[PDB]
Design a protein around this ligand. Structure first.
Ligand SMILES: *[C@@H]1O[C@H](CO)[C@@H](O[C@@H]2O[C@H](CO)[C@@H](O[C@@H]3O[C@H](CO[C@H]4O[C@H](CO)[C@@H](O)[C@H](O)[C@@H]4O)[C@@H](O)[C@H](O[C@H]4O[C@H](CO)[C@@H](O)[C@H](O)[C@@H]4O)[C@@H]3O)[C@H](O)[C@H]2NC(C)=O)[C@H](O)[C@H]1NC(C)=O
Ligand SMILES: *[C@@H]1O[C@H](CO)[C@@H](O[C@@H]2O[C@H](CO)[C@@H](O[C@@H]3O[C@H](CO[C@H]4O[C@H](CO)[C@@H](O)[C@H](O)[C@@H]4O)[C@@H](O)[C@H](O[C@H]4O[C@H](CO)[C@@H](O)[C@H](O)[C@@H]4O)[C@@H]3O)[C@H](O)[C@H]2NC(C)=O)[C@H](O)[C@H]1NC(C)=O
Ligand SMILES: *[C@@H]1O[C@H](CO)[C@@H](O[C@@H]2O[C@H](CO)[C@@H](O[C@@H]3O[C@H](CO[C@H]4O[C@H](CO)[C@@H](O)[C@H](O)[C@@H]4O)[C@@H](O)[C@H](O[C@H]4O[C@H](CO)[C@@H](O)[C@H](O)[C@@H]4O)[C@@H]3O)[C@H](O)[C@H]2NC(C)=O)[C@H](O)[C@H]1NC(C)=O
Ligand SMILES: *[C@@H]1O[C@H](CO[C@@H]2O[C@@H](C)[C@@H](O)[C@@H](O)[C@@H]2O)[C@@H](O[C@@H]2O[C@H](CO)[C@@H](O[C@@H]3O[C@H](CO)[C@@H](O)[C@H](O)[C@@H]3O)[C@H](O)[C@H]2NC(C)=O)[C@H](O)[C@H]1NC(C)=O
Ligand SMILES: *[C@@H]1O[C@H](CO[C@@H]2O[C@@H](C)[C@@H](O)[C@@H](O)[C@@H]2O)[C@@H](O[C@@H]2O[C@H](CO)[C@@H](O[C@@H]3O[C@H](CO)[C@@H](O)[C@H](O)[C@@H]3O)[C@H](O)[C@H]2NC(C)=O)[C@H](O)[C@H]1NC(C)=O
Ligand SMILES: *[C@@H]1O[C@H](CO[C@@H]2O[C@@H](C)[C@@H](O)[C@@H](O)[C@@H]2O)[C@@H](O[C@@H]2O[C@H](CO)[C@@H](O[C@@H]3O[C@H](CO)[C@@H](O)[C@H](O)[C@@H]3O)[C@H](O)[C@H]2NC(C)=O)[C@H](O)[C@H]1NC(C)=O
Ligand SMILES: *[C@@H]1O[C@H](CO)[C@@H](O[C@@H]2O[C@H](CO)[C@@H](O[C@@H]3O[C@H](CO)[C@@H](O)[C@H](O)[C@@H]3O)[C@H](O)[C@H]2NC(C)=O)[C@H](O)[C@H]1NC(C)=O
Ligand SMILES: *[C@@H]1O[C@H](CO)[C@@H](O[C@@H]2O[C@H](CO)[C@@H](O[C@@H]3O[C@H](CO)[C@@H](O)[C@H](O)[C@@H]3O)[C@H](O)[C@H]2NC(C)=O)[C@H](O)[C@H]1NC(C)=O
Ligand SMILES: *[C@@H]1O[C@H](CO)[C@@H](O[C@@H]2O[C@H](CO)[C@@H](O[C@@H]3O[C@H](CO)[C@@H](O)[C@H](O)[C@@H]3O)[C@H](O)[C@H]2NC(C)=O)[C@H](O)[C@H]1NC(C)=O
Ligand SMILES: *[C@@H]1O[C@H](CO)[C@@H](O[C@@H]2O[C@H](CO)[C@@H](O)[C@H](O)[C@H]2NC(C)=O)[C@H](O)[C@H]1NC(C)=O
Ligand SMILES: *[C@@H]1O[C@H](CO)[C@@H](O[C@@H]2O[C@H](CO)[C@@H](O)[C@H](O)[C@H]2NC(C)=O)[C@H](O)[C@H]1NC(C)=O
Ligand SMILES: *[C@@H]1O[C@H](CO)[C@@H](O[C@@H]2O[C@H](CO)[C@@H](O)[C@H](O)[C@H]2NC(C)=O)[C@H](O)[C@H]1NC(C)=O
Ligand SMILES: *[C@@H]1O[C@H](CO)[C@@H](O)[C@H](O)[C@H]1NC(C)=O
Ligand SMILES: *[C@@H]1O[C@H](CO)[C@@H](O)[C@H](O)[C@H]1NC(C)=O
Lengths: 494, 494, 494
């Protein structure tokens, strides 16, 4: 008739997702993303990090030079992958502080070996065994030299090697533990051995232990592996009177990003920055629930399987009660499921007809704030390489308990941080979208000084004759109240 | 007279509690809970966890089989409790890596012992001492076998025991350290002993040390305790030429939730899930300030003695200035101390009389949001069992420094998390209660289109004749402005 | 003319600082502080902590009593400072568990030495060497006693020392490692040494190692340093048959706040509570980016170089478009750069003239909330003394990896806490300043019931004749609407 109705509202959707905030345990929204990566392809991608697959070789057999591990000489890696089908097929051995040696060689990232001229005098070199067959003949570790009595004598050995280079040199050496008192004299003339290996600042002395051990590949004897690092400017001395497994050369040492991982996943051709023991995962999401062990740029490990970030507004599903008069309704009531052009918009009822449109500035302002919110506080990426061990096969006691306690403390503190951040950010999102709605209302109310009244459905009963051009002026922000003031005041108050 | 007054407000209380928020260091509220448990009954509750009280026995004397500890054979526990009055009354001994053995046996949770048929040949078994009297006679540890020379000989001993079962076997053994060179030959024919104990993958060799030590229970000699774990499929070999304290059998090994705690509190009949060394505490509150050492489902340890969570709204104490005309006042002014039915409510001044009532929907909405707020972010419970040691009696150096540094880092990071969460949640509570108040006001203002005006005390001067039925209609949400519009407009503007 | 204009606004500045919030990556403010200390004077301040500068002495040479370190006898410290130019000039030595001994002596905080009467019988005391010249003569460590054969004999030594005091006693002792089999017999008659040192509860036995090592100051022989702690009530026994470096007395042991730091900064006269290896830094700011190593009350280490806390409101720079009519504009439009008396204020356009003033209560309320905000959640100070090592010169393996992993976990968790707190607090600051603005508006609107209208520039077109006294009444809070109601209603609606 003589008056007009102009209402404000926001878009609704039929199928919405539940989220969690500070104030409510579940609310419904128009749209929500996932922030926890729960899946893996099950394969290890070979770019961009250099992957070296050990097949039946451990890293400690590859370094000593076991015969089925001779493909690995002078190799380099970013990540070394060990398989659970790996075995040993040479002289039986133990390494005191095995975990320490494995970690030191993994972080160096190379098996570069330089043969040096060591002069062993009055002894027979290149000792062998049928526990280590290289071809039909007997053999031994390619990087160690078994020394034994020449004629009926083993002289006190005294050799020196100086570092005049500008890098560090790692020497691997050992000692033979014979099973009887009748084997010692047969190989090394003496009855009790001794091996001393020293620099200017450090020393180690080992004595051999004699007695019977379980049979492994036809022997009840064992070797024990040791190591020494010689710095630039320092000297090495070796002084043994019996039972010495001599070094043949040194290994170069580098500082870099190299590491080691126990996996059973196949290796494939693809590009992925994060590797887990369950295969490579993508790094688009900030958190991950696949595995606590990782390498390269990776998401943070949390205990949760799902965290949903509200990327839209609240979803009051349109009351399916469609008015008989098709009464335009507002935001205080419900959402509008018939709006596609934008989030916030205007519906006008006029003599001319019913109509609809969308507001660009309001929608854009909400979208710009919402895009990249998580990016503001937590970092895009976090690269880590060589870390600690997080899974154990044996019981050890104190140090293993401390390692397990340090990892659990870290996981519980990053899981609490991930729960609070999603609830805080979800709250702030619902608040900014709701204030934006009420901001367009106050703007509309301010332009209509005394020529409109509020109904409380989210609607402004305008008390003059508004045509399409007049509605368009309000929408734009050029509505001139003075023109229709007299007519509206005479219509509303009399 | 011809007009009416309708005011909105919220309840006040006389005695209120101070809280802390992001924005203010102290604010007064109607009601507040405590979140830090500061007290204990001083007793250890025997349900639901199985408590085994050691009386004068340590866990390492119970395992070796000291005579005053024979009540403990084949025992099982969830928590083992050690007392400060505990002592030793057998052969004097030391355990290298004592802390490691104590932690391994505590997490297993049993003293199940299976005697095995070991054949010691050419030696005299069941050696004894008057430092360990079981009855009037001499005695020894019930689980160890002291072996000595038969006639004038001690043969090289070589025995083997295979694991064909499907579980792990823990063997405890040792070595005797005699005080002179004249005692060695007297017991074991040789002048220098040796004990080797090996599997397929591991070995240990110990040599004995001779010399004088302080007198303990009439002896200057000592025993040293060692241990070996044999996995399913593996073998054990023992090869000693002198000074062997032989094993008698193995201990079963389990993986579970068992642990050990040093306390002096009495044990009583009651049900409590959390145990501390100061007695059992309840687990209703999220944080605790009693002790950093804990077992079972327990609250998190923080440094603070008090953290108060606002469970009510702000408390503007009713200005005791009671108006002479008894002028109804609103929320912008003060609180209402005369309201019991609900938090938010209406007071009406009419020709009929003064009156009061309460609003249910508004009060319920505030209460539902406030109930269970903390439950949304922090977890209800956190069960932990075997952890690290947090109190030390000796100085050790590096490892102890790292253990103390790891615990302090955890406490400072959980104390900062507990301070921020209470301040954040308290802020959000005050905000939601204040917005709820302003929401009922806008609802009231919207229903009274042009028949009422705002005074600014929190009151609506209605400009027609409102009776009890009219006030009731506003309160309900069925007020029909059109009926009194003409009368009110003629009364207010002319 | 017949009407008046009264507008509300807030102060603007020309040069503003960008900050970061939850909702926006950069916003402009009137004023902002820095919270990260990035600079140091480069000197170590000598008050209030007692600094003891080692010059060419390490703490382990000062304790043994090397000749160039005799100024350090009976010294005490809170912090001991080691220099990179330090060297050794006595008998060459190694300490097994060197890191453990250095940490134990540093936390005690004294070199107090009590000479005790030990009776060495049948041996020659005060052995010497030209590797340690004290004057022209040969010399040795001042706190150790080299013992050697008297005539042609070295008796088995058996001595005892009881603790009857009420404090702990630290004894430092050692063993000589000779380079040949011809040097052993020459000094100590036997061919193989032994040193046993025991209490009632503990024992250590060391055997000497013979062989050649690199030359240091004309010797191929070395000493190995050991230690024992004897508690109140306990006894010490020493039982050596050769190669004993005997103790001369004990060191007192204290529990306190003492520590050690490797620095190269000069020591100066000034007062500073926090010391770093880059010199003393002030502790006014909560975070610091100078160094992860610290001593005393210090700010927390974070990875960031800058974190800016908004201490003012938002800065909408005054549109330099100055109205031709000099139209007073409000807050919805821009800020006011012409206001110095306060933040929030009123500008009045009247027949009398244009004018300006400031509101005290509103400005004060905002300032009081903003002052000390950070103080509410994070603690003013955090004192720490003896901690762990955070920089290493050698590769060691497992324990060093765990130490490095524990420090990185702590740094990443405190850097995430510092990023979120600044973004949260900055958001809350912008919100409280903006609500304060809208609170003065509603107060102004409420006082002008029907005698004013809103324009939407932040202005109230008052529809009567307002003079300076009338404007002053509004500003005060004594404006009486009734007086001008009839005139304003006849002017605005007709
Ligand atoms: C101290 O005590 C230990 C433990 O008792 C002794 O160690 C044992 O020594 C014997 C003799 O060396 C070892 O016996 C050998 O076992 C080999 C492996 O056996 C496996 O494979 C065979 C074939 O499949 C199976 O039958 C068997 O069950 C195992 O699965 C055998 O292959 C060896 O065979 C040799 O002898 C036979 C004789 O018939 C010949 O036909 C062969 O050609 C070959 O020469 C042999 O039987 C035994 O394994 C050791 N046990 C362990 C676990 O260590 C020490 O000998 C003892 N030392 C001293 C000094 O007393
Ligand atoms: C190397 O050096 C060490 C240290 O000097 C020597 O060790 C000492 O050896 C002697 C002899 O074995 C020990 O003496 C014994 O002490 C026992 C405990 O004494 C406590 O209780 C008594 C009674 O209450 C108190 O008087 C005393 O103050 C203590 O509180 C005594 O009970 C023993 O008594 C025996 O001898 C007496 C003689 O009168 C008889 O009446 C008794 O029946 C009994 O046979 C005895 O006196 C002494 O404790 C050791 N000290 C320590 C601390 O070890 C080594 O002997 C020495 N070794 C060599 C090889 O030289
Ligand atoms: C086992 O094997 C080791 C390693 O080979 C041997 O150790 C070497 O032993 C020799 C002899 O003791 C050491 O030689 C000595 O070196 C001293 C230091 O040399 C430095 O300074 C000089 C002078 O500036 C430089 O020329 C040199 O390059 C070094 O920078 C010399 O000062 C000693 O001099 C002595 O002899 C000379 C002879 O001309 C006299 O003039 C002097 O007065 C003085 O008496 C001497 O040359 C050598 O350093 C050892 N090397 C290492 C690194 O240990 C063991 O001897 C050997 N042991 C056995 C038992 O076989
Ligand atoms: C493993 O690597 C070593 C070291 O070689 C270095 O590392 C490799 C991975 C490559 O990057 C090389 O380019 C790099 O130099 C190899 O040692 C090398 O061995 C050869 C043969 O013994 C040496 O050649 C000798 O040179 C001398 C003259 O100096 C002649 O007298 C000899 O007749 C002979 O030609 C070469 O110098 C040496 N390189 C060194 C020491 O750097 C090693 O062969 C290699 N092994 C395998 C299996 O690949
Ligand atoms: C400690 O426990 C062991 C092992 O017994 C097992 O653990 C207990 C806590 C209970 O749960 C038992 O049900 C469980 O089996 C006891 O060992 C047992 O000892 C007895 C007596 O030596 C064995 O009986 C023998 O059986 C053989 C036939 O196999 C006969 O020839 C013998 O004459 C005799 O009857 C029994 O088999 C054995 N159980 C085993 C090995 O599992 C042990 O006695 C017990 N000690 C105490 C003090 O309670
Ligand atoms: C290092 O310190 C010790 C211990 O002295 C104590 O610590 C100091 C830092 C000061 O605070 C002292 O006040 C404190 O006591 C010194 O030991 C002392 O040595 C002297 C000389 O040998 C002892 O005096 C003797 O006393 C006896 C009688 O008991 C007489 O028979 C002797 O003739 C002689 O006068 C003094 O008792 C002793 N103090 C003790 C044991 O506490 C030490 O001299 C000192 N060294 C240096 C270089 O300063
Ligand atoms: C990625 O690989 C890891 C293994 O490296 C997978 O974790 C493993 O998941 C299984 C199934 O949940 C766990 O088995 C269960 O163990 C418990 C405790 O022993 C037992 O009670 C159950 O009956 C069952 O055997 C297994 O323990 C677990 N391994 C570890 C060490 O956590 C993980 O599921 C894989 N993830 C993906 C996404 O593929
Ligand atoms: C629960 O039991 C623990 C002990 O297991 C109690 O902690 C102890 O409290 C006392 C009193 O505060 C502390 O004593 C003080 O120690 C300091 C530092 O040495 C000293 O300067 C004081 O003079 C006083 O002796 C004691 O150290 C502390 N023990 C520990 C290891 O923290 C605790 O109070 C008990 N709590 C409850 C609620 O019962
Ligand atoms: C306070 O002193 C510390 C040293 O104790 C200073 O840290 C050092 O800063 C320099 C320059 O950034 C670092 O050098 C660089 O190291 C990297 C990695 O090796 C290398 O790639 C670069 O080429 C360069 O050499 C040095 O490593 C670093 N030291 C440590 C251990 O962090 C610090 O800058 C000083 N701070 C102030 C405020 O004076
Ligand atoms: C909900 O908002 C998210 C924003 O993360 C939209 O997510 C994108 O959806 C498309 C669909 O093809 C994906 O290809 C993109 O990778 C998503 N992310 C980005 C980077 O835009 C999602 O489309 C929105 N959902 C609806 C229904 O609009
Ligand atoms: C303040 O609110 C708390 C909510 O925690 C009320 O606390 C309850 O008080 C009763 C009093 O008998 C206890 O028995 C309950 O255990 C408390 N908790 C629960 C679970 O309801 C408290 O009553 C309120 N105070 C006032 C004055 O109303
Ligand atoms: C911005 O607010 C800060 C509050 O931290 C003001 O900082 C003070 O500035 C004076 C300038 O002489 C310093 O001496 C003080 O140490 C600062 N802190 C305190 C404790 O007041 C700063 O002045 C303000 N800036 C402006 C332009 O007003
Ligand atoms: C208000 O609503 C109640 C039902 O909740 C009803 O009993 C009462 O009659 C209503 N009062 C009116 C319409 O005045
Ligand atoms: C406003 O209040 C002040 C006191 O703060 C007073 O001096 C002044 O006269 C008052 N002005 C009025 C009522 O116009």
């Amino acid at each position: 008739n003589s008056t007009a109705t102009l209402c404000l509202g926001h878009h609704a959707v039929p199928n919405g997702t539940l989220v969690k905030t500070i104030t409510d345990d579940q609310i419904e929204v128009t749209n929500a993303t996932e922030l926890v990566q729960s899946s893996s392809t099950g394969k290890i991608c070979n770019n961009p990090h250099r992957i070296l697959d050990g097949i039946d070789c451990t890293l400690i057999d590859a370094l000593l030079g076991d015969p089925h591990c001779d493909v690995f000489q002078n190799e380099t890696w970013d990540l070394f992958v060990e398989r659970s089908k790996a075995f040993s097929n040479c002289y039986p051995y133990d390494v005191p502080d095995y975990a320490s040696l494995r970690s030191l060689v993994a972080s160096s990232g190379t098996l570069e070996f330089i043969t040096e001229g060591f002069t062993w005098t009055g002894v027979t070199q290149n000792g062998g065994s049928n526990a280590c067959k290289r071809g039909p003949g007997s053999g031994f570790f390619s990087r160690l030299n078994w020394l034994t009595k020449s004629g009926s004598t083993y002289p006190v050995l005294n050799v020196t090697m100086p570092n005049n280079d500008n890098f560090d040199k790692l020497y691997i050496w050992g000692i033979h533990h014979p099973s009887t008192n009748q084997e010692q004299t047969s190989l090394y003339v003496q009855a009790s051995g001794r091996v001393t290996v020293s620099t200017r600042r450090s020393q180690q002395t080992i004595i051999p232990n004699i007695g019977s051990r379980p049979w492994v590949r036809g022997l009840s004897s064992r070797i024990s592996i040791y190591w020494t690092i010689v710095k630039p400017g320092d000297v090495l001395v070796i002084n043994s009177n019996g039972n010495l497994i001599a070094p043949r050369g040194y290994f170069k040492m580098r500082t870099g990003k190299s590491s080691i991982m126990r996996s059973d996943a196949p290796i494939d051709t693809c590009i992925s920055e994060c590797i887990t023991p369950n295969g490579s995962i993508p790094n688009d999401k900030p958190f991950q629930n696949v595995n606590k062990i990782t390498y390269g740029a990776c998401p943070k490990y949390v205990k949760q399987n799902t965290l949903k970030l509200a990327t839209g507004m609240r979803n009051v599903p349109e009351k399916q009660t469609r008015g008989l008069f098709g009464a335009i309704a507002g935001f205080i009531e419900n959402g509008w499921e018939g709006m596609i052009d934008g989030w916030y918009g205007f519906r006008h009822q006029n003599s001319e007809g019913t109509g609809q449109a969308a507001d660009l500035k309001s929608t854009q302002a909400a979208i710009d704030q919402i895009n990249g919110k998580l990016n503001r506080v937590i970092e895009k990426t976090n690269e880590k390489f060589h870390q600690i061990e997080k899974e154990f096969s044996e019981v050890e006691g104190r140090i293993q308990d401390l390692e397990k306690y340090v990892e659990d403390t870290k996981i519980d503190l990053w899981s609490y941080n991930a729960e609070l951040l999603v609830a805080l950010e979800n709250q702030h999102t619902i608040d900014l979208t709701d204030s934006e709605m009420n901001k367009l209302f106050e703007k509309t109310r301010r332009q209509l000084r005394e020529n409109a009244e509020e109904m409380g459905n989210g609607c402004f009963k305008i008390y003059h004759k508004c045509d399409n051009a007049c509605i368009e002026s309000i929408r734009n922000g050029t509505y001139d109240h003075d023109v229709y003031r007299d007519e509206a005041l005479n219509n509303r108050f009399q």
